[PDB]
Amino acid sequence: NYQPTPEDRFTFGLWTVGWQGRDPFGDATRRALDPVESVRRLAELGAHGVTFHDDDLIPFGSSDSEREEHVKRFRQALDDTGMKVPMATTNLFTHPVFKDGGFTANDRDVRRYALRKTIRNIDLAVELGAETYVAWGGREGAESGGAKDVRDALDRMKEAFDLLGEYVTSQGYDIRFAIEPKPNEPRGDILLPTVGHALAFIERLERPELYGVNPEVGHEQMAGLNFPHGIAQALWAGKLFHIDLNGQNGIKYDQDLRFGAGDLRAAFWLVDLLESAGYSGPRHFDFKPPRTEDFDGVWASAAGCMRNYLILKERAAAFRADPEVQEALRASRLDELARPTAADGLQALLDDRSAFEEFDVDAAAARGMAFERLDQLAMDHLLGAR
Amino acid sequence: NYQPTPEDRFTFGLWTVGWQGRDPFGDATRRALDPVESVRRLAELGAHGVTFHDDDLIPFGSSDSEREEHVKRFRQALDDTGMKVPMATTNLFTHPVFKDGGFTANDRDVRRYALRKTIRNIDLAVELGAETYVAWGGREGAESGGAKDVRDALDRMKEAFDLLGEYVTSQGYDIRFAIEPKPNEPRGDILLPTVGHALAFIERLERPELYGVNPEVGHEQMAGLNFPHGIAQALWAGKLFHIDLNGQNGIKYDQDLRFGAGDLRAAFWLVDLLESAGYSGPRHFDFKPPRTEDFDGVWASAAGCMRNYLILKERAAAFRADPEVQEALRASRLDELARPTAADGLQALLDDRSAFEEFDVDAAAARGMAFERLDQLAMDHLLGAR
Amino acid sequence: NYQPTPEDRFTFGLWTVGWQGRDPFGDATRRALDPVESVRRLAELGAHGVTFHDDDLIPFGSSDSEREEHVKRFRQALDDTGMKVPMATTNLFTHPVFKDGGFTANDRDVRRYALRKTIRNIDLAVELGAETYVAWGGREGAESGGAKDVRDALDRMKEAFDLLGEYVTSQGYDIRFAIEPKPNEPRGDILLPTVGHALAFIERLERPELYGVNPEVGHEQMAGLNFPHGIAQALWAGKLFHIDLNGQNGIKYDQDLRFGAGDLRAAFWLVDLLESAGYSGPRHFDFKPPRTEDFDGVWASAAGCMRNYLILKERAAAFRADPEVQEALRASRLDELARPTAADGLQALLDDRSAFEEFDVDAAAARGMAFERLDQLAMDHLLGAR
Amino acid sequence: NYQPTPEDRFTFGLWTVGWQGRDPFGDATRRALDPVESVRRLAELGAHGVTFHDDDLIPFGSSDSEREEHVKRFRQALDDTGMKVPMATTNLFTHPVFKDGGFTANDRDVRRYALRKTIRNIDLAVELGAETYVAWGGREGAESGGAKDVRDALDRMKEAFDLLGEYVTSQGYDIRFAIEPKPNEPRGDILLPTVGHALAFIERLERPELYGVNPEVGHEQMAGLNFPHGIAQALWAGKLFHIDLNGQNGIKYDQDLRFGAGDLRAAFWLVDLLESAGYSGPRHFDFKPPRTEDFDGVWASAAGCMRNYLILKERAAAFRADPEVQEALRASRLDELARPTAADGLQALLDDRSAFEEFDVDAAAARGMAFERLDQLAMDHLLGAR
Ligand SMILES: OC[C@H]1O[C@H](O)[C@H](O)[C@@H](O)[C@@H]1O
Ligand SMILES: OC[C@H]1O[C@H](O)[C@H](O)[C@@H](O)[C@@H]1O
Ligand SMILES: OC[C@H]1O[C@H](O)[C@H](O)[C@@H](O)[C@@H]1O
Ligand SMILES: OC[C@H]1O[C@H](O)[C@H](O)[C@@H](O)[C@@H]1O
Ligand SMILES: [Mg+2]
Ligand SMILES: [Mg+2]
Ligand SMILES: [Mg+2]
Ligand SMILES: [Mg+2]
Ligand SMILES: [Mg+2]
Ligand SMILES: [Mg+2]
Ligand SMILES: [Mg+2]
Ligand SMILES: [Mg+2]
Ligand SMILES: [Mg+2]
Ligand SMILES: [Mg+2]
Ligand SMILES: [Mg+2]
Ligand SMILES: [Mg+2]
């Protein structure tokens, strides 16, 4: 009955179950968790691994000797539990120095500091075995129009990622980068606000094959966009390196609800897509147990993330295996969508009079697409009414 | 006092001033305009040129002989007035045959028909002197998740644009393509919903240099995105081939208000950016005079589009020329944003102890950015209080 | 297996299954349905009744003799099928005369005409047995700020509804009015945009007991509001006279998807609320079969509306009957929410030192609310994983 | 040149200029301000007065003797500067005990504590001369459907406000209450989410004349609603007791930008309305200087709030005084909107054949409303191009 195992590759950020509940209007409602206890608790729930910002693991300002002590304790908990660390990232948003951004801060000395803080953590990530290094530029942006020349900012952003790519290739590291877009919050508008803007930007980097995207369910939904469509475009481009799963109720602040909450039907189509495209990366939950909860609610919320993925996986697999659905997909011509429009080539298309001169536009127009029957079959499967 | 001339390159679609006022809840409130009278009226107002869909100019279903008569009348009005036709496009959305799309319809025969209808109009556009050919895939999309495999749809979309590019290069035509994104309406979700998704898609075409974007103010704002930021990214990529100007009040149906209505401060920053980047393409208005108006209101609304652009152009130029603003831009370190982060290279950055070991993070954090004073100077200029 | 019967009180507007598929960018994809055939087809599917605008039933402009012929044919189909007509409404939005509104048009003669057209249909509605008369002011609004003084418009709106109330009471009719709010579309902003604004307005009418609300799922969601919360407020006020059920994916144009599509979890909480509050009015579907569909898709979409309501009704009833859920509701103190805060009165509260001086704020703060476990039980029930 | 004086009645919350810059992703960027220094600085800028939460003035947990010391220092700064305190409010959102709300917390003992904490501050407010007591129920709400029975919550909310009203009338205090709506943040959905919902709720209180609304520009815009329309409805009801002015760019997190930023044209229509309706309450700024700013930017941002109000006031007054605008208002029949539809009464309307039988619907339909010319005159005035 929907029990996770480490083979399902579910991972969690230390900052998710460790969120103390401080929001812009209220104090923390929970005490801080020791990273070691989070690793142990998540292993008991069936998680595969954890992820971290540098500052989640090593408190800002630590001497190099305290740094080594923090890493050693952490490594011991990984060894004790079998937990992996597939992804790491840099905190370039909490400290006041980053108030105008990290890579695109107007102050050049802050931009250099941001790069040095990142490189330091790339080394640590590689040491712990991370395969993906995520960058969320949460402070790269503006509240007003004149504060940021965006063309210069994009030059500075390209400069920073190119330097990171030069660094990992010169060190011989097997790590790739994933850019995580978000349209706004905490800045009024954030640079590279959606999956598409991030994909387009990567194509202008010096070594584009090193960079992909880490889309988050709730972030694309904060722009009212269709998250499974955006994932499909990322898979089509070959760039889905990692994914952040959670829930979001529409266009408002970033709620980071547990996965399956928010838009349930979008969650169903997302799982259907990830499973049928053979996505094999981590299923990472970037979520925040609501600040109404005590510690038992934190672990129930985390367990719910995994449970909902596994239920949706079962319902999507049943949907695609149902002969009646396979019939309906052909009735709606999904098979014809997958066939080339003009494999016969341009010249044959131009001479083909059934494509224009003799095309019966009124007969083609009358054909129904039968999409509503297909979508009700999908609803019946999601709800277990089939 | 803000009088346009053809040197300002203002253009209008035939379908804008010709919109009869039919909306999803109501009949037309205005009679149809003859394209010839629209060209004459727009020339009197100071417009530079007009744009058209094939079906605006040649009623759907016309015999080749009626086609020639429509083009000849149109060409005579252009000659009589001096009006240009810089852009043309295809209607792949009104006729019922296109109800599931044109290039990405599930039915293969509709996709072939869509391509033939487009190619036919590309020839006409070239004959009339158009330099840009726009594609707005308004029906490419879905209302439900199972109706459209988006990876196959993107294959079909790439297939169609690659064929169009093969066609124009084999004919030797000097015309480029611009993809116009829109996130939704009339489909529940439209493929390539934003500037960024369109930019990313173009990089996967066989001949990317032939394709750019035609962003529309209101369309990016229907996803709550910052339109001047998205334009900056398109300019940075070298892809801003054309632009649709209008107004939109936030996230709702596509209002297509006259330019300057909707988000006035975004209009100001857009004009500032287009003028300071030296955009030299048409300033095209894709707007709809509200259906409350009679024909005198149609021409007042069209005149307002141009008037508002010219007022904003004057206020943006004054803002950038004001020595106090130039001082404030330096106070906020816009100059430093334009300087490379690490022209000294990766190795120098790694050995630079002022970038990390000796960086005074608390001193840098205390520096104010002075953005609010800059933004109030921008407000004062917009309002003519300077 | 989720078969409707007329006892479930499902009703449909003639304009829903009869929508021809004309949207702002495209022609009709389906021929017009005879109202008589819609009544027969809906009776076969298990519907309880139908609703109509005057202009759905009697084509605009009909002579009084054609009017009588249309009503007689309609009445015969009702008799033949047993279908009821519980609600009727007036079309004050399609004809061009209504382009600036009906009750709040700036032109006084249009406002008088709007009232006469309404009164005429109130008589017909009463004759056919309607119990509720709906008013959707779709054209009452503005695209620009100076076009409409809203205080004067609200005076005109109060004037119109007061006259309608004087009319029904002077005729001795047993009919009540329900105002249907919508925030925008087709006007840029519509007056009384949400349930709350409509409830507040009713309290200023001369005879408030005659007026309630007819909320629509998709309309409150076009403002990003929680529809079950808004229904709860309407029930709390005693004003939920009627309801329009459908589906909507977030903040965009009014999609009018079949009920159960859009926000599925909101549909679940809505059904839970209607059923547990004992709402006994019609379950009315105001939806539009997508224009991709032929006539078989129209009836499948209509059947899906009812099927989804009945599935959700079953899952909500199971949720509330589950002893584990009843336990969890007490764990989250839903029982305590239902108990008065201070039945002991103001003076006892002021003298109660356990309410302030001796209140242990830190102990109360540490208590978890256990909401995530409750919400996962609700998810499990919705998905049939319980 | 747009210099404020205390006669303009501009007020500021202590928490606005005192916001330290802590957001959900970052630490404070500014040190705390002493309330005494904020009062002095705001008096120098031309403010009329300040407002406070209990916890802004008296740190949570203070002994009664420290309480008296805080009030005395504060009162001395008011005396020294001439600053007034027209409004006060209660912090029922920051402390963890309020994580599930104050008046509608599920735990009864928290609800009693919330009431006692409020009553204590009502006494203080009266002592300092406040005329309005604001309630913003920021924690009254839910993230999930089963956590909160909204009908019971509204019972608890009515219970709390009725008790407050019994308290002020039994003490003989001349103070009125204003409810401040907000649709979401920090809860997933907040009870009474808009002006309309708050107006409707007040009509069910035992003593409705004691309660009005305190709408905030940005909060109604977070639901995509037209703020000047919502203010007009509040004025029409006689309930606009207070107003929070600021700026907001569309549907996203609550930005609290300085007034005039965000939607500039909505700011213009708001000022036009407040000034022409003779609103005489405080012009209160609930805004947050962005966390990019140092203390000089804080005071520049505060000064900008007042400057923008005064510029907009001048442009709106010029607009309404312009004879050409007065002509255009008559051309668009704003005069006719203000005249009763049917002062002749119901029976005369029914016998008036020019209202229906002989009404020339096609002639009335052809009349243009001339709204676009009016709106361009309004644009010209806003921009100082007239
Ligand atoms: O970069 C990793 C994470 O960092 C921050 O916590 C962001 O809020 C989250 O969206 C992001 O995924
Ligand atoms: O493709 C050209 C135009 O066609 C349609 O009219 C669209 O509504 C508009 O957005 C687009 O720019
Ligand atoms: O007034 C009844 C109906 O009329 C119109 O069709 C509206 O679009 C719908 O929302 C409303 O319910
Ligand atoms: O209640 C007074 C104020 O308290 C809080 O600071 C809210 O964020 C603000 O919206 C409200 O006006
Ligand atoms: Mg997030
Ligand atoms: Mg996130
Ligand atoms: Mg994330
Ligand atoms: Mg548009
Ligand atoms: Mg458009
Ligand atoms: Mg366009
Ligand atoms: Mg609707
Ligand atoms: Mg509707
Ligand atoms: Mg409806
Ligand atoms: Mg706010
Ligand atoms: Mg606020
Ligand atoms: Mg406020």
Q: Is the CB of B180 under 6 A from ligand 2?
A: yes
Question: By the 8 A CB rule, do B168 and B122 touch?
Answer: yes
Residues 6+ apart with CB under 8 A from C301: A372, A376, C258, C287, C289, C290, C293
In whole angstroms, what is the distance from residue C370 CA to residue C328 CA? 8
Distance CA D357, CA D342 (A): 17
CB atoms < 10 A from the CB of A186, how many?
21
**What helix, strand, coil percent values describe chain C, rounded to 5?**
50, 10, 40
Q: Which residue of C has its CA nearest to B25?
A: C94
Cis peptide bond N-terminal to D186, omega within 30: yes
CB A36 within 8 A of CB A73: yes
Ligand 2 atom closest to the CA of B53, numbered from 1: 2
With an 8 Å Cβ cutoff, is B61 touching chain C? no
* Amino acid at site D271: V
CA atoms of D128 and B200, how far apart (whole Å)? 60
At C53, give phi and psi (nearest 5°). -80, 150
Identity of the residue in A262, A290, A311 whose CB atom sits nearest the CB atom of C372: A290
Q: Whose CA is nearest to atom 4 of ligand 1?
A: A136
**From the CA of D59, how far away is ligand 5's center (Å)?**
32
| Residue found under tokens 């030296």 | B278
Q: How many residues does chain D have?
A: 386
Q: How many residues does chain B have?
A: 386
Q: Is C53 a catalytic residue?
A: yes
Task: State the nearest Cα–Cα gap between C93 and chain B, in angstroms.
Answer: 6
User: Is residue A209 a known part of a binding site?
Assistant: no
**Exposure of D358 by Cβ count < 10 A (0-12 exposed, 13-18 middle, 19+ buried)?**
exposed
Contact (Cβ atoms closer than 8 angstroms) between residue B107 and residue A367: yes
- State how far Cα B117 lies from the chain centre: 23
Sign of the Cα pseudo-torsion (A289, A295, A297, A299, in order):
positive
- CA of residue D131 to ligand 4 center, whole Å: 17
Is C219 annotated in a binding site? The answer is yes
Distance CA A270, CA A265 (A): 9
Q: Residue C317 and residue A363: Cα distance in Å, rounded?
A: 47
Nearest to A143 among D96, D100, D257 (CB): D257
Nearest bound ligand to the CA of residue C252 = 11
Locate A236 and state its tokens. 């089509």
CA distance A382 to C383: 7
Longest dimension (CA), chain B: 80
Instruction: Measure the CA–CA gap between A250 and A253, rounded to whole angstroms.
Output: 9
Number of other CB atoms surrounding residue D155 within 10 Å: 18
User: What's the Cα-to-Cα distance from B291 to each of A268, B34, B382, rounded to whole Å?
Assistant: 41, 18, 30
Cβ neighbour number for residue C204 with a 10 Å cutoff: 18
Q: Supply the range of the domain harboring residue D102.
A: 1-386
Of D253, D282, D257, D254, residue with least CA distance to D267: D257
Give the closest residue to D56 by CA, choosing from D32, D77, D72.
D32
Q: Do A368 and C293 touch (CB under 8 A)?
A: yes
Pick from C296, C311, C379: CB nearest A385: C311
Give the whole-angstrom CA distance, residue B183 versus residue B219.
7
Q: What percent of chain B is helix, strand and coil (3-state, nearest 5)? A: 50, 10, 40
Q: Which residues pair with A178 in a beta bridge?
A: A134, A212
Q: Any idea which residue has 């203070």 for tokens?
A: D62
Cα–Cα dist A383/A377, whole Å: 10
Q: Give A306's contacts in chain C (Cβ within 8 Å).
A: none
Which chains contact D through at least 3 pairs of Cβ atoms less than 8 Å apart?
Answer: A, B, C
Token readout for B20 is 């009869």
**Measured distance between the N- and C-terminal CA atoms of chain B, rounded to whole angstroms:** 18
- Could you tell me the maximum CA-CA distance found in chain A, to the nearest angstrom? 80
Picking from D313, D287, D311, D314, the residue whose alpha carbon sits closest to that of residue D299 is: D287
Q: Show the 3-state SS of D78-132.
A: HHHHCCEEEEEECCCCCCHHHCCCCCCCCCHHHHHHHHHHHHHHHHHHHHHCCCE
**D295-321 vs B371-382: helix axis angle to the nearest 10?**
10
Q: Say if ligand 4 is within 6 A of residue D254 CB.
A: no
The neighbouring-strand residues paired with D103 are none
Pocket test for ligand 2, best of B98, B133, B286 (most atoms within 8 A of CB): B286
Ligand 13 centre to CA of D152 (Å) is 28
CA atoms within 13 A on the CB side of D289: 32
Which residues in C lie closer than 8 A to residue D103 (C-beta atoms)? 341
Residues of chain B numbered 316-355 and touching chain D (CB < 8 Å): none
Residue C331 is encoded by which pair of tokens?
A: 């764990």
Resolution (A): 1.7
Pairing of strands A132-135, A84-89: parallel
Instruction: Please name the residue ranges forming H helices in chain C.
Output: 14-17, 35-45, 54-57, 64-81, 108-128, 150-171, 195-202, 217-221, 227-236, 264-276, 295-321, 323-331, 334-337, 345-351, 361-366, 371-383
Provide the β-strand partners of residue A13: A51
Q: Which among A106, A224, A337 is the nearest to B334, CB-wise? A: A106
Structural contact between residues B313 and B52, judged by C-beta atoms closer than 8 angstroms: no
Residue C356 contacts B where some CB pair is shorter than 8 Å: no
Measure the CA–CA gap between D48 and D6, rounded to whole angstroms: 4
**Residues of D whose CB is below 8 A from A261:** 144
- Measured CA to CA, the distance from residue C380 to residue C319 in angstroms comes to 9
Question: Is B180 marked as binding a ligand?
Answer: yes
Contact residues, A window 253-272, toward C, CB-based 8 Å cutoff? 258, 260-265
How buried is residue D107: exposed, middle or buried, by Cβ count under 10 Å (0-12/13-18/19+)?
Answer: middle
Determine the Cα–Cα distance for residues C233 and C199; give it in Å rounded to an integer.
Answer: 9
Of B229, B277, B378, the CB nearest to A146: B378
Distance from CA of C296 to the nearest CA of B (A): 16
| Identity of the residue numbered C309 | Y
Backbone angles phi, psi at B132, to 5 degrees: -130, 140
**Which residue from C minimizes the CA distance to D95?**
C365
Cα gap B303→C63, rounded to integer Å: 44
Question: How far A342 CA sits from the closest chain C CA (Å)?
Answer: 24
Residues of C in contact with D353 (CB under 8 A): none
Q: How far apart are CA D122 and CA C350, in angstroms?
A: 13
Task: Report CA-CA distances (Å) from D158 to C328, D162, D200, D204.
Answer: 26, 6, 12, 8
Which residue is listed with tokens 């064929």? B163
Structure token digits, residue B208: 């990317």
**Ligand 2 binding pocket includes B161 (Cβ within 6 Å):** no
**CA atoms C71, C77, C78, C79: torsion sign:** positive
Structural domains in chain D (count): 1
Cα angle, residue B271 at apex, residues A251 and B195 outer, rounded to 5°: 45
| Residue to test with chain D: of A182, A222, A292, most D Cβ within 10 A | A292
Q: What's the CA dihedral at A9, A15, A18, A20 to 10 degrees?
A: -150
Q: Which residues line ligand 3 (CB under 6 A)?
A: C 15, 89, 134, 136, 138, 180, 216, 244, 286
3-state secondary structure D274-342: HHHCCCCCCEEECCCCCCCCCHHHHHHHHHHHHHHHHHHHHHHHHHHHCHHHHHHHHHCCHHHHCCCCC
Number of DSSP helices (H) and strands (E) in chain C, helices first: 16, 10
Contact (CB, 8 A) for D134 and D242 = yes
Put simply, the chain D residues between 208 and 227 with a CB less than 8 A from any chain A CB are 222
Active centre residues of D (catalytic):
53, 56
CB D221 within 8 A of CB D262: yes
**What residues in A contact D93, CB-CB < 8 Å?**
25-26
Q: Please give the torsion angle defined by the CA atoms of residues C325, C326, C330 and C332, in that order, rounded to the nearest 10 degrees.
A: 20
- Which residue type is seen at D39? V
Two tokens at C107?
């032109």
Q: Shortest CA distance to B380 belongs to which of B335, B316, B332?
A: B316
Known catalytic residues of A? 53, 56
CATH of the domain at D50: 3.20.20.150
Q: Which residues, chain by chain, have CB under 5 Å from ion ligand 15?
A: D 216
Q: In whole angstroms, what is the distance from residue C320 CA to residue C312 CA?
A: 12
Tokens of D149: 């029975």
The residue behind tokens 């005729």 is C171
Q: D347 pairs with which residues across the strands? A: none
Pairing of strands D244-245, C283-285: unpaired
Q: Which residue, among D109, A294, D114, D113, has the nearest Cα to C333 in the 3D structure?
A: D109
Beta strands at B189-190 and B141-142: parallel, antiparallel or unpaired: antiparallel
Find the D218 Cα to ligand 16 centroid distance in Å.
Answer: 9
Q: What are residue D293's DSSP bridge partners?
A: none
Contact in structure between A106 and B336 (CB atoms under 8 Å) = yes
Closest-CA residue in chain D for C320?
D146
The single residue listed with the structure tokens 């989804």 is: C308
d(CA A186, CA D290): 11
Cβ contact C56:C128 at 8 Å? no
Chains in contact with C, where contact means 3 or more Cβ–Cβ distances below 8 Å, are: A, B, D
Ligand with the closest atom to the CA of C135: 3
- Which residue in chain A has the smallest CA separation from D96? A29
